[PDB]
Design a protein around this ligand. Structure first.
Ligand SMILES: COc1cccc2c1cc([N+](=O)[O-])c1c(C(=O)O)cc3c(c12)OCO3
Ligand SMILES: CCCCCCCCCCCCCC(=O)O
Ligand SMILES: CCCCCCCCCCCCCC(=O)O
Ligand SMILES: CCCCCCCCCCCCCC(=O)O
Ligand SMILES: CCCCCCCCCCCCCC(=O)O
Ligand SMILES: CCCCCCCCCCCCCC(=O)O
Ligand SMILES: CCCCCCCCCCCCCC(=O)O
Length: 582
């Protein structure tokens, strides 16, 4: 177009335009005050409007990269605040924008964002909606400078509905806090997959990413032909490679191009895309990414004919090995939306290894005849684990399910910090709660998605503060092998028990007067610390001690004197528990 900024403004709408321009400045100038970015936004928006009225007005034909970089270089404090990033302004485009991109700081060391009281939030929301929500947007954007801006905007708009509904409710906090917790966990998760996907592309290559994408898109678009899936995989690989480089506008163009191709070809891809494809550009590609799987075609034949029985297996494979493995993966995936993507990749890897071994033999068919039997234990292993864990979650409830996991994992890797053991065990309990309510045909994809987020969080914490080599291995192997690796962890035999520290097992009266969540953590903390002190304790000996602590709390809490109970009866529980484990 003659004026990129006019076209963006017309397509997006003023309100969406303003929001994104705020996110984009906040992601680059992460240390500047909210009020400075509001002024930059208003100037850029006023200029955009001059181009909307006349596409030939002065400077309106400059690239949006040029205008954005030009405006970055107007910031008076650029050098004093950002140092060498101010030297980016001495370059011309496209080198200037590349330079700015390299100075985004993924760890800007900003104070934690403190959640105000519910009534303070609802009063701020009422008295000034715009500043209230837009300031928070700026705060999140400047802490998450690679977070895809449109998706950050999609989260922000859902906060409005939450405040509109809950601030007119009778119990405002009971209404509002669960939704804000859900929105925040959803945001942190989306951030987790984004950074996880880019890291995986760098370490394990384009080929491995394409394999993941064949499987995922074949589950999603089972009626599409392989040639069509393969094209989508190529284009999707390009989009993610560009989006991982990190420039908003080049990412957004690639994503919109793919969405428009998908929407122009729905007849050959999926019957479930009509709604997404009538949405505005801003939302189309995100909507398509969340489309539910199309219904699979009826009475599809078994894979045995083309991949085991045919005389031409080895010949078709040898001609173009990755194209044939892709076809095997496409046929298997489209038939099994109930499988994790990584389970499908394990079947593909198994098939490839067998073909590599067997096509060398004189009778390849006899060699690979039973290959589909090799898939049986790979499929049943996750299926059985889901059943086991969903049964225990129902028997125990979320909390006591968390406690069963906490003891299990503390014994397996007792060297992990207690805060991490508590947080990870809790989050794993929440994966059980979420995914065990899905029917069996959607449980493995759910667990794959939410475990990826939890195990990724574990691994980042552990890379930052390494303590266990077994965890470093599970965290550094292929993503296909990460969860089985962790599942294979065994109780640590060579752990020397941590020395007794009395204050660790000293509880005061405040425990009764604490948020139910914080009371769970503190109880979960002493449970880990108990296991860390006596890692050979039995389930019998542990539930016995945990029952004594449960009386110790309920008595000393509803007592005329609470403190003296905690200190005197506290020595009694510790000494009894000490003898009951030593
Ligand atoms: C893209 O993320 C956001 C966009 C827009 C608003 C918010 C938000 C993220 C968060 N947060 O901190 O994760 C919150 C919280 C919270 O959870 O404390 C409390 C709030 C919020 C937001 O708007 C007013 O009150
Ligand atoms: C058509 C392009 C993709 C073809 C992929 C065929 C299968 C590749 C090998 C098996 C999967 C390996 C996955 C991984 O190493 O992470
Ligand atoms: C000075 C303006 C700089 C920022 C401009 C932001 C434009 C973002 C458009 C995003 C469209 C999303 C499309 C898609 O994700 O498929
Ligand atoms: C950056 C990704 C843009 C996505 C555009 C639509 C592509 C097809 C959607 C099917 C699901 C893809 C999920 C994924 O991208 O990991
Ligand atoms: C506590 C987590 C949810 C309950 C069941 C989890 C069982 C292990 C993971 C299932 C499969 C995930 C993906 C995979 O490795 O194929
Ligand atoms: C983060 C605490 C120490 C390490 C814990 C490893 C986590 C293993 C989870 C593997 C997948 C679920 C297994 C299960 O649900 O039984
Ligand atoms: C070394 C002696 C320690 C004795 C005290 C151990 C306290 C463990 C409490 C764990 C409670 C978890 C279950 C519950 O929520 O009641």
């Amino acid at each position: 177009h003659k004026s990129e900024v006019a076209h963006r403004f017309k397509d997006l709408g003023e309100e969406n335009f303003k929001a994104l321009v705020l996110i984009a400045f906040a992601q680059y100038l992460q240390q500047c005050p909210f009020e400075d970015h509001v002024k930059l936004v208003n100037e850029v928006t006023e200029f955009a409007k001059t181009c909307v009225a006349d596409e030939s007005a002065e400077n309106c034909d400059k690239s949006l990269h040029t205008l954005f970089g030009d405006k970055l270089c107007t910031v008076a404090t650029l050098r004093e605040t950002y140092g060498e990033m101010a030297d980016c302004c001495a370059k011309q485009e496209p080198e200037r924008n590349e330079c700015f991109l390299q100075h985004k700081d993924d760890n800007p060391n900003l104070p934690r964002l403190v959640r105000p009281e519910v009534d303070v939030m609802c009063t701020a929301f009422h008295d000034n909606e715009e500043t209230f929500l837009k300031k928070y947007l700026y705060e999140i954007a400047r802490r998450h400078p690679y977070f895809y801006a449109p998706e950050l905007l999609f989260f922000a708009k859902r906060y409005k509905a939450a405040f509109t509904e809950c601030c007119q409710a009778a119990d405002k906090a009971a209404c509002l806090l669960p939704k804000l917790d859900e929105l925040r966990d959803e945001g942190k998760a989306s951030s987790a997959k984004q950074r996880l996907k880019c890291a995986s592309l760098q370490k394990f290559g384009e080929r491995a990413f394409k394999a993941w994408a064949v499987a995922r898109l074949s589950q999603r678009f089972p009626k599409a032909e392989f040639a069509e899936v393969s094209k989508l995989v190529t284009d999707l690989t390009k989009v993610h490679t560009e989006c991982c480089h990190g420039d908003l506008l080049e990412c957004a163009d690639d994503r919109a191009d793919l969405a428009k191709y998908i929407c122009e070809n729905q007849d050959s891809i999926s019957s479930k895309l009509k709604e997404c494809c009538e949405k505005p550009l801003l939302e189309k590609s995100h909507c398509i990414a969340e489309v539910e799987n199309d219904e699979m075609p009826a009475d599809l034949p078994s894979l045995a004919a083309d991949f085991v029985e045919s005389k031409d297996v080895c010949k078709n494979y040898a001609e173009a090995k990755d194209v044939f493995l892709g076809m095997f993966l496409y046929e298997y995936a489209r038939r099994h939306p109930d499988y994790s993507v990584v389970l499908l990749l394990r079947l593909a890897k198994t098939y490839e290894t067998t073909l590599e071994k067997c096509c060398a033999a004189a009778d390849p068919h006899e060699c690979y005849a039973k290959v589909f039997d090799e898939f049986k234990p790979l499929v049943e292993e996750p299926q059985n684990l889901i059943k086991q864990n969903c049964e225990l979650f129902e028997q125990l409830g979320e909390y006591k399910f968390q406690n069963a996991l906490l003891v299990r994992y503390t014994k397996k890797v007792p060297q992990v910090s207690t805060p991490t053991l508590v947080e990870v065990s809790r989050n794993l309990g929440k994966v059980g709660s979420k995914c065990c309510k899905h029917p069996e045909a959607k449980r493995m994809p759910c667990a794959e998605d939410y475990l990826s987020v939890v195990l990724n969080q574990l691994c980042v914490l552990h890379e930052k503060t390494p303590v266990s080599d077994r965890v470093t291995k599970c965290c550094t192997e292929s993503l296909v092998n990460r969860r089985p690796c962790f599942s294979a962890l065994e109780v640590d035999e060579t752990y020397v028990p941590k020395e007794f520290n009395a204050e660790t097992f000293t509880f005061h009266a405040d425990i009764c007067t604490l948020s139910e969540k914080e009371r769970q953590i503190k109880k979960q903390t002493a449970l880990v610390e108990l296991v860390k002190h006596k890692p050979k304790a039995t389930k019998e000996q542990l539930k016995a001690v945990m029952d004594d602590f449960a009386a110790f709390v309920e008595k000393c809490c509803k007592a005329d004197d609470k403190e003296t109970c905690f200190a005197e009866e506290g020595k009694k529980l510790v000494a009894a528990s000490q003898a009951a484990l030593g």
